[PDB]
Design a binder for this molecule. Structure first.
Ligand SMILES: NC(=O)C1=CN([C@@H]2O[C@H](COP(=O)(O)OP(=O)(O)OC[C@H]3O[C@@H](n4cnc5c(N)ncnc54)[C@H](OP(=O)(O)O)[C@@H]3O)[C@@H](O)[C@H]2O)C=CC1
Ligand code: SF4
Ligand code: SF4
Ligand code: SF4
Ligand code: SF4
Ligand code: SF4
Ligand SMILES: [Zn+2]
Lengths: 189, 112, 92, 126, 161, 172, 144, 340, 193, 57, 198, 118
């Protein structure tokens, strides 16, 4: 009942409810809530836009979600170590994120039009660069076992083949729309 | 649509499979090396050092005798309650106490 | 010493029954903070107006509050509206 | 190269853009606080007790989350609480199409498709 | 004259039961996401021997992690009954503890203790992986100790009568 | 038809024969169907209260036809007999006899059919499904009954009986 | 929050004036007293008692009585309802709660023969306080 | 009198409501204890249970903790059972004191049977007279409690009932006759013996003993009604079924409800008693069980009845049918029955 | 529980130095104290034993070595209580050492002189988890709470304080039982000149 | 943590597997449900017979 | 709003019988337009959108109902205009908003249907748009909007054996029914909800 | 910034930092903080009861963020596993003791956090 739960509380009182909605991606939902609040307020978070922290947090959340999805898909297919690798990467990402809010998976740092400018360290950026190098290495290691494995290919080749009209009928979006050949993405619109 | 650009997984390195990704990796390595060299140039690093006097009951605007009496009333002997220093730091706006990390950062072994 | 609920006591402690032993508050408020703050002495201040924040810096304690040390009666101390500290006039 | 500068220490300056472009707001934020400004104290009280008032109206804002377009449609009747708040989670759409995609597949293929549908049960349940 | 061997036997049984406290592979929400992160290489629950078992008939530790609703309470009770004895229960997360943010929701069980008996609870929402590990360690210590809690009284010959 | 109530959604009597070597047939009116109910189309719009009443009677008959299987499968036959459960359901339906909106009646009928199918699919717990089938004003036949109120409040009016009990906790 | 500037810019020490003592009905906080003359006007025109006036000048004008006394005029509950700031408050209700935690229901009194309409604010099983209701046919907007 | 039994309660509440009843329950780790705890807390009552059952990880203690809602139930651990101070602390602020502590069927030693029953009843009742806050005191005794009974458990129950009546003048002595339920020890005993043998059920006599089984829910309702009745203070109540049945009749009823053919292999009572006395006793094998099967347990009518509490118990056949659905013999059934 | 320090670990100058310094008991006990890795016994570098960075009030000894192969495994602490392999728990750490060991702040607790944390009068010693133990925190209105009756009476008296009726024998002025009021306030108008 | 450096995890696992109780569901034939494990175990230990550890060994 | 935007007047041109009322605001994006439509020509509008060039490349983005029964402008009451969605909602009892995205025109359209009948019955677009099945099921389960001639009327998110519409202005936060564990039944039972209040 | 165990902070003299502003109760998103306040015997604005239901407390730290006198804090204590759901319902005295145990590290964290904008 998150709908009525938010509807019966003030605007800030329902803030963490968005994190519980998308458990894997708690930053994208918070950013969406902040943008919607700003649109209702008719303004924009100047400090958040100028600091690029919103973009960095969205990219980190997207990376974490992709790692978690890869781990779950590998576990379901039968790969038991990619889950551990993606979980280590997600642990590093959550450690980086918690330096801004103090929580591993429910940060709720993004406010409607205010930004906690004090919680900004350059050491965080340096560690983010180091984590980016480590994540590149981890992605290479993961692709070394899932991209070319014949078992994985035969377990995914031509599986669930959808199309443009099929996606349009049910409104499939995101990675599904991208795989269906649809070039629709709110980021680049 | 009439001239697609296709990214094809061909090498064992997904980063090598994309020229932009290899450039990003090289840029990250160069930036890390430059930051490391810039830090190594100084050889010492400032760091935030808390002080027990920061958790003092009264601010600098208070009188010197009153500050010492307040510090003694709470049974405080760890924070600096010197009257001379309190008078000398009257209405001060220093940043904070800071420590200096001295390179190289190595484990202090007890070997004999 | 004076019996509680007296007219003089009500006039003194702003129409409240002050607790000397402070155990009544330590039970009612579940904390001996009343007696702990009462252990503090009375401070004499030269200025007729003081700025109290309960600490050493802005946001390091309570919000700054201006207390008037110069009243109708000389030597009447005032406890902080933000902290437990009390300040009084230097001389009168 | 300086000797006592964070720029000398770290090349990244997270406050440089905001300080250069919005110096007035940057100084106002770095200088005044609720413990020092009575207006800021009133702002802290209102934000923590009743919250900032929102003009009446219905809007729909979507953000490109990793699972797709996650949208929030908020209609506020002018009060501190929105009159209605609907959430369009792409996970719900992915769940609505799995049977259309699951037809003809074996059990292992069904498990693989459930994994590849990118559906988070919390997003669908709301 | 049966408690002499039983006491060493009780100690060995307690050590064995603590060494194979297998958590149930049953997770629901962000608390369960944190618990899964506690199964990662960085957080080696295998060091304490916690290996997730899918079947309640073969499980000993019920890691109730998530929010309980009106559409899941009977299933939770059925799983708790179907859990092989002896069994321990640990409710991780505020939702599993007392509903948490949804403590006033019409579609919330309003507490997992009102549905199934719970042995241990974790406070965080979500609790850290370290918090879950500490809770598991405390539960293991309690289970090892609870086997011989000195319920029986010692006779004049220092023998539990 | 391609529906949960369709004639072809019947479990074959034999592994190779529908009903017998001479004729076919199966039981789906009083028992569950062969496959799950993929879709539950909304009831056709009835513009007449006569049609609404006919639909309500059909729903009541359908519910009655499955009361035996519902009681047997849930092991809740001790609480009340099949006729007793039918009488209780009839009383419950009579409680809502005041309705006069065809659309509301159709929506209620659809919801009731969905709930019955959920019960037919055993997706709901028996202890919760007993709420609709429980006796209106009589003790459950699966447990003993105490006439303490009937004896103590013997011939006592409803107002007096309510006054003697107390509407809220007596301690707070 | 509505008609204000948004930020403060007067970075100086604030003036301070000690509060007064007027009994257990009027809670005095002269520091927040904006010298709005609301108390003086209400006492002179509504209650009819003459004990409130403006003493001093400049930035140190005293919003209170000249001598130390209590304000007992059977309308002390209107003094708190008349102060636009936290200068005058209900001492029995002081620090009781905030408006965010009070549930108000409109009813009529029985303590006075007029039965003036009032609003009783309560929090849970405990009744918090009562305030006057605008009833020109019974008692305008003042109560005993 | 000097101790007022008045305990006004609002029973119209729920699990999370407030009824005004504070209770201390001793010896609730059995089958009836959890039922009584659930019955009292169902109207929103405060329950405190002192317990020291070995192997505390057993579901009994955790389930007893679930008898009342969170913040309404307390489980005192490692009660000494011989400490008057501990007993006084247990019911320090409790208006109800319910003692169901009694010798288990597996318990066989005459000393322990006498010790547990007699001493516990005496100490609990004496403590009940020292705390004036107690409004009601209840002792769960056996229906077949008699002084001359060959069953040492029955003799100790009669002696403990006498001691409890002596120490506390306004006590309530319950005498249930073979209460039937889910975790009971008669239907469960028969099912367990039949399943372990898979051929027949062992009997040691002619099964001519008369019994009047009652439902556990019926017993709980009767206990609630008695707690709601002032005249029940200092009264002995008997709880038997609506109709009397022999042991053979009970076996036949169980077979008819379950459909399993009732086959009973008879054995010599003397040799059976000698073997069950000359060895260690368990829940499924007890000389006390043999003696009780060789004993008559009926509602003697020497005191008040469940009818005095005005509760009409349901049929034991109906209860058994409700309780043993899944143990039915798999006979030839219609095709519709295959889809269960 | 045997062979806390293996031969390979014992075949290093660090092992000999530590054994000669701290003794055989301390050398063996460290392996049973805070066993993290057989190659990490007393540190990763084999040239010597890592120095004791500090000592906790509960007897725990906190050390740090940068030679560990894992970045998150820099600082370690050895507890005094090692009854079993899983006897100690993560709740035995002091409040001062908690920030240092968790990398919350590089500042570490100091026994005397300059201290990384303040030392106020109201400081209380940190204790382990009191859950499932007799020292568990007791709410005011819990059933096992020995004084929950007083708390319940106080809570009820907030808005539902009962009337103190007479209890026992007393004078009766007609049908009105004669009893004096117990109001703490004193009516001065009735007794004044 | 199973003993010294977790050297006895297998023994603890076997002991715990012994410790946990097993209940046969009422909906299945207890005879077959029990005979299947016993038959599997008897067949399991027989693998040691058809094994050679050396020449004619 | 520096992109090319135009009102989809082709809808009213094809309809030729409905007075078109369109609204565009800067609170939403530059490609979002909201129009009120009569429920009578609702299936017809849906079909025309679903099978028309320059509009067939559309997908239903979201669908949500608004209980316009108690939605009242809290502040700035005098600021209401004569062409305001707030005034329109205050006029009606419920407002069903369906938001679709047209990739061919790359725009966002929001059809708002005003419901005033007590039955809250409207036609179902499930037979037109595939995603509308689960969406309309959830909408009916939460707000009671009766989708006539719908593909499936089965429950979506509501608890089993529970007949209520929690997403309604009348329903309190706590509800009315709470489930506990009945030891007398050895299973989960449901009773009245006695909730703790702040 | 780790939002650990909820605790009640105090001034260095030991006096209660809570000024009974009800900001924490109005800021608890789930209303997990309950306050019952009356004038103190000395006249201070302090609560007679301050309760935090950890069963309904998200440990979000919003009360600390909106704390007016830095009273409610989130100490680093994370090993707060409770064997009793009733024991999990912390109260005023329990919070005061928890703050007393971990005040030093909390003080260092507060000083460092204040120094961030300072
Ligand atoms: N079952 C029946 O049909 C009938 C039962 N009764 C009596 O009803 C009573 C209540 O029944 P029920 O709930 O099933 O209880 P049980 O008979 O099954 O168990 C005995 C209870 O008392 C405790 N207990 C046993 N021995 C001792 C002892 N020496 N000292 C202290 N405590 C002890 C047990 O705890 P622990 O786990 O620690 O052993 C348990 O709580 C019993 O005493 C029984 O004799 C009477 C007539 C018929
Ligand atoms: S307690 Fe918190 S983290 Fe856990 S499931 Fe609930 S909202 Fe999510
Ligand atoms: S009513 Fe208040 S603000 Fe106005 S003059 Fe009086 S004290 Fe000052
Ligand atoms: S609440 Fe109002 S009167 Fe009180 S200090 Fe704040 S602004 Fe002034
Ligand atoms: S914000 Fe701080 S001072 Fe104000 S009521 Fe809450 S805890 Fe007390
Ligand atoms: S930490 Fe968050 S949820 Fe917990 S009491 Fe504070 S504001 Fe409420
Ligand atoms: Zn102060």
């Amino acid at each position: 009942g998150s709908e009525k739960l938010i509807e019966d509380r003030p605007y800030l009182q329902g803030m963490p409810y968005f994190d519980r909605f998308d458990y894997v991606s708690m930053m994208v939902q918070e950013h969406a809530y902040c943008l919607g609040i700003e649109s209702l307020l008719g303004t924009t978070n100047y400090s958040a836009t100028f600091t690029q922290i919103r973009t960095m947090y969205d990219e980190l959340t997207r990376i974490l979600n992709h790692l978690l999805a890869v781990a779950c898909h590998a576990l379901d297919v039968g790969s038991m170590s990619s889950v551990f690798w993606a979980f280590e990467e997600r642990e590093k990402l959550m450690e980086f994120y918690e330096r801004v809010c103090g929580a591993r998976m429910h940060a709720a740092f993004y406010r409607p039009n205010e930004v906690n400018l004090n919680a900004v360290s350059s050491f965080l950026m340096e560690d983010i660069l180091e984590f980016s190098r480590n994540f590149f290495t981890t992605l290479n290691e993961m692709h070394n076992v899932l991209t070319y494995n014949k078992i994985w290919k035969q377990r995914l080749i031509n599986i669930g083949t959808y199309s443009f009209q099929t996606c349009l009928d049910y409104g499939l979006t995101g990675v599904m729309a991208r795989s269906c050949g649809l070039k629709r993405d709110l980021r680049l619109s | 649509k009439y001239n697609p650009e296709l990214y094809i997984y061909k090498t064992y390195d997904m980063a090598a499979d994309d020229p932009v990704w290899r450039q990003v990796k090289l840029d990250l390595e160069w930036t890390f090396e430059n930051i490391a060299e810039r830090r190594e140039s100084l050889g010492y690093m400032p760091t935030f050092k808390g002080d027990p006097n920061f958790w003092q009951a009264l601010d600098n605007s208070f009188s010197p005798e009153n500050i010492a009496q307040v510090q003694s009333s709470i049974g405080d002997k760890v924070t600096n309650i010197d009257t001379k220093a309190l008078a000398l730091n009257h209405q001060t706006e220093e940043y904070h106490k800071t420590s200096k990390l001295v390179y190289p950062i190595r484990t202090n072994l007890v070997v004999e | 010493n004076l019996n509680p609920y007296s007219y003089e006591a009500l006039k003194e402690n702003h129409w409240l029954v002050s607790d000397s032993s402070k155990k009544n508050s330590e039970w009612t408020h579940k904390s001996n903070a009343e007696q702990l703050i009462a252990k503090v002495p009375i401070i004499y201040v030269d200025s007729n107006i003081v700025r109290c924040i309960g600490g050493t810096e802005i946001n390091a304690g309570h919000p700054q509050v201006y207390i008037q040390l110069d009243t109708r009666k000389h030597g009447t101390p005032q406890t902080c509206k933000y902290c437990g500290l009390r300040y009084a006039k230097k001389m009168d | 190269l300086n000797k006592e500068n964070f720029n000398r220490q770290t090349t990244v300056l997270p406050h440089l853009v905001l300080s250069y472009l919005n110096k007035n707001d940057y100084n106002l934020k770095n200088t005044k606080n609720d413990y020092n400004s009575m207006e800021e104290l009133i702002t802290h009280f209102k934000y923590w007790s009743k919250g900032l008032k929102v003009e009446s109206g219905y809007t729909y804002q979507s953000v490109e989350s990793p699972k797709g377009e996650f949208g929030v449609s908020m209609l506020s009747d002018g009060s501190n609480k929105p009159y209605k708040c609907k959430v369009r989670s792409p996970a719900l759409h992915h769940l609505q199409v799995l049977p259309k995609i699951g037809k003809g597949h074996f059990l292992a293929d069904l498990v693989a498709l459930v994994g590849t549908v990118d559906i988070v049960f919390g997003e669908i349940d709301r | 004259r049966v408690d002499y061997i039983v006491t060493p036997i009780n100690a060995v049984v307690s050590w064995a039961r603590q060494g194979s406290f297998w958590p149930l592979t049953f997770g629901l929400a962000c608390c369960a996401v944190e618990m899964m992160h506690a199964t990662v290489s960085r957080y080696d629950f295998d060091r304490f021997g916690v290996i997730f078992r899918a079947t309640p008939r073969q499980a000993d530790l019920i890691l109730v992690a998530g929010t309980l609703t009106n559409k899941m309470a009977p299933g939770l009770r059925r799983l708790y009954e179907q859990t092989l004895d002896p069994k321990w229960v640990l409710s991780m997360g505020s939702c599993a503890n007392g509903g948490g943010y949804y403590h006033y929701s019409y579609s919330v069980v309003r507490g997992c203790n009102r549905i199934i008996p719970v042995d241990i609870y974790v406070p965080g929402c979500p609790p850290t992986a370290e918090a879950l590990m500490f809770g598991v360690l405390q539960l293991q210590k309690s289970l090892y100790r609870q086997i011989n809690e000195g319920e029986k009284k010692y006779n004049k010959k220092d023998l539990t009568y | 038809m391609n529906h949960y109530w369709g004639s072809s959604n019947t479990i074959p009597a034999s592994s190779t024969q529908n009903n017998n070597y001479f004729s076919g047939g199966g039981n789906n009116v009083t028992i569950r169907g062969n496959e799950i109910m993929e879709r539950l189309p909304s009831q056709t719009p009835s513009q007449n209260m006569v049609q609404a009443s006919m639909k309500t009677l059909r729903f009541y008959r359908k519910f009655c036809r499955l009361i035996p299987f519902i009681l047997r499968i849930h092991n809740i036959g001790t609480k009340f007999t099949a006729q007793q459960a039918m009488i209780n359901f009839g009383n419950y339906i009579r409680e809502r006899n005041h309705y006069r909106d065809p659309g509301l009646i159709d929506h209620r009928i659809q919801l009731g059919y969905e709930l019955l199918y959920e019960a037919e699919m055993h997706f709901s717990q028996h202890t919760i499904l007993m709420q609709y089938l429980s006796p209106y004003n009589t003790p459950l036949s699966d447990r003993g009954y105490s006439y303490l109120e009937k004896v103590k409040y013997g011939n006592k009016s409803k107002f007096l009986q309510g006054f003697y009990k107390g509407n809220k906790p007596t301690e707070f | 929050s509505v008609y204000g500037y948004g930020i403060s810019r007067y970075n100086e020490y604030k003036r301070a004036v000690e509060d007064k003592n007027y009994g257990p009905l009027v809670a005095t906080s002269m520091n927040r007293c904006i010298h709005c003359t609301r108390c003086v006007r209400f006492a002179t025109q509504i209650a009819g008692v003459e004990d409130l006036g403006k003493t001093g000048r400049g930035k140190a004008a005293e919003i209170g009585t000249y001598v130390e006394k209590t304000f007992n005029t059977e309308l002390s509950g209107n003094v708190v309802d008349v102060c636009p700031v936290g200068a005058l408050t209900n001492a029995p209700y002081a620090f009781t709660s905030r408006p965010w935690e009070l549930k108000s229901f409109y009813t009529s009194d029985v303590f006075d023969t007029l039965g003036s309409a009032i609003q009783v604010d309560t929090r849970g099983p405990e009744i918090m306080r009562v305030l006057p209701r605008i009833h020109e046919e019974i008692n305008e907007e003042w109560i005993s | 009198q000097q101790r007022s039994t008045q305990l006004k309660f609002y029973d119209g509440g729920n699990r999370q409501s407030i009824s005004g009843i504070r209770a201390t329950i001793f010896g609730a780790t059995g089958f009836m204890g959890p039922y009584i705890g659930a019955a009292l807390g169902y109207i929103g009552s405060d329950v405190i249970f002192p317990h020291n059952h070995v192997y505390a990880y057993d579901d009994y203690v955790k389930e007893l903790k679930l008898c009342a809602g969170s913040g309404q139930s307390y489980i005192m651990r490692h009660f000494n059972y011989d400490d008057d101070n501990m007993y006084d602390m247990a019911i320090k602020n409790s208006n109800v004191v319910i003692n169901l502590v009694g010798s288990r069927l597996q318990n066989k030693n005459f000393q322990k049977a006498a010790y547990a029953n007699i001493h516990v009843a005496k100490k609990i009742a004496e403590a009940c007279a020292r705390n004036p806050n107690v409004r009601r005191l209840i002792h769960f005794s056996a229906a077949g409690a008699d002084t001359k009974s060959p069953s040492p458990d029955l003799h100790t129950k009669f002696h403990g009932e006498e001691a409890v009546l002596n120490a506390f003048p306004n006590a309530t002595i319950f005498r249930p006759c073979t209460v039937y339920g889910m975790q009971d020890y008669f239907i469960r005993h028969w099912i367990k013996e039949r399943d372990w043998w898979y051929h027949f059920n062992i009997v040691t006599d002619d099964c001519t003993a008369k019994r009047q089984p009652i439902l556990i829910n019926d017993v709980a309702q009767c206990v609630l009604n008695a707690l709601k009745l002032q005249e029940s203070a200092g009264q002995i109540y008997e709880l038997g079924g609506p109709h009397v049945y022999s042991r053979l009749e009970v076996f036949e009823m169980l077979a008819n409800l379950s459909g399993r053919p009732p086959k009973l292999a008879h054995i010599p009572h003397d040799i059976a008693l000698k073997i069950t006395q000359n060895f260690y006793n368990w829940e499924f094998f007890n000389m006390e069980k043999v003696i009780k099967d060789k004993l008559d347990l009926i509602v003697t009518g020497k005191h008040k009845t469940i009818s005095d509490l005005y509760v009409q118990p349901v049929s034991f056949p109906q209860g058994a049918e409700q309780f043993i659905d899944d143990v039915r013999y798999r006979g030839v059934e219609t095709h519709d029955n295959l889809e269960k | 529980g045997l062979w806390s320090w293996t031969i390979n670990q014992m075949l290093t100058p660090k092992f000999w130095v530590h054994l000669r310094r701290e003794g055989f008991i301390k050398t063996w006990t460290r392996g049973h104290k805070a066993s993290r890795h057989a190659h990490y016994v007393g540190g990763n570098r084999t040239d010597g034993y890592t120095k004791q960075v500090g000592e906790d009030e509960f007897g725990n000894r906190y050390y740090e070595d940068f030679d560990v192969d894992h970045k998150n495994q820099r600082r370690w602490v050895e507890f005094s209580d090692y009854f079993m392999q899983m006897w100690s728990n993560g709740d035995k750490v002091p409040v001062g050492w908690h920030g240092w060991l968790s990398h919350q702040y590089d500042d570490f607790p100091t026994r005397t002189g300059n201290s990384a944390f303040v030392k106020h009068h109201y400081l209380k010693q940190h204790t382990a988890n009191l859950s499932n133990t007799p020292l568990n925190h007791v709410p005011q209105g819990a059933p096992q709470n020995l004084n929950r009756m007083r708390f319940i009476t106080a809570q009820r008296d907030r808005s539902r304080a009962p009337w103190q009726s007479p209890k026992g024998e007393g004078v009766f002025q007609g049908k009105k039982l004669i009893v004096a009021s117990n109001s703490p306030f004193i009516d001065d108008m009735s007794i004044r000149d | 943590y199973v003993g010294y450096r977790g050297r006895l995890q297998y023994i603890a696992d076997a002991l715990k597997l012994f410790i946990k109780g097993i209940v046969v569901p009422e909906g299945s034939n207890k005879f077959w449900f029990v005979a299947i494990p016993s038959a599997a175990g008897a067949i399991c230990y027989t693998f040691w017979i058809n094994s050679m550890w050396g020449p004619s060994v | 709003m520096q992109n090319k935007y135009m009102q989809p007047i082709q809808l009213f041109i094809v309809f030729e019988k409905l007075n078109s009322k369109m609204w565009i605001s800067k609170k939403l994006n530059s490609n979002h337009s909201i129009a009120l439509i009569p429920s009578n020509w609702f299936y017809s509008i849906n079909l025309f959108l679903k099978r028309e060039l320059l509009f067939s490349n559309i997908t239903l983005i979201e669908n949500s109902a608004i209980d316009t029964i108690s939605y009242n402008l809290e502040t700035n009451q005098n600021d209401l205009d004569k062409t305001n969605i707030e005034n329109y909602f205050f006029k009606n009892k419920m407002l069903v908003f369906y938001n679709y995205y047209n990739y061919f025109l790359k725009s966002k359209l929001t059809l708002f249907i005003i419901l005033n009948n007590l039955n809250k019955s409207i036609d179902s677009i499930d037979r037109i748009f595939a995603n509308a099945n689960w969406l309309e099921r959830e909408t009916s389960e939460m707000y009671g909007i009766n989708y006539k001639w719908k593909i499936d009327t089965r429950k979506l998110l509501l608890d089993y054996s529970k007949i209520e519409n929690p997403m309604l202005k009348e329903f309190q936060s706590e509800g009315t029914q709470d489930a506990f564990y009945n030891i007398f039944e050895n299973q989960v039972v449901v009773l009245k909800n006695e909730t703790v209040e702040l | 910034l780790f939002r650990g165990e909820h605790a009640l902070r105090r001034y260095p003299t030991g006096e209660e930092r809570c000024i009974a502003c009800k900001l924490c109760q109005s800021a608890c998103p789930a209303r997990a903080i309950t306050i019952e306040t009356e004038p103190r015997p000395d006249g201070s604005r302090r609560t007679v009861r301050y309760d935090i239901d950890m069963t309904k407390c998200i440990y979000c730290g919003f009360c600390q963020e909106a704390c007016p006198v830095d009273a409610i804090v989130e100490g680093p204590n994370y090993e707060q596993t409770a064997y009793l759901h009733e024991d999990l319902f912390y109260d005023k005295y329990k919070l005061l003791e928890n703050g007393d145990k971990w005040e030093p590290q909390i003080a260092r964290n507060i000083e460092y956090l204040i120094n961030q904008p300072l």
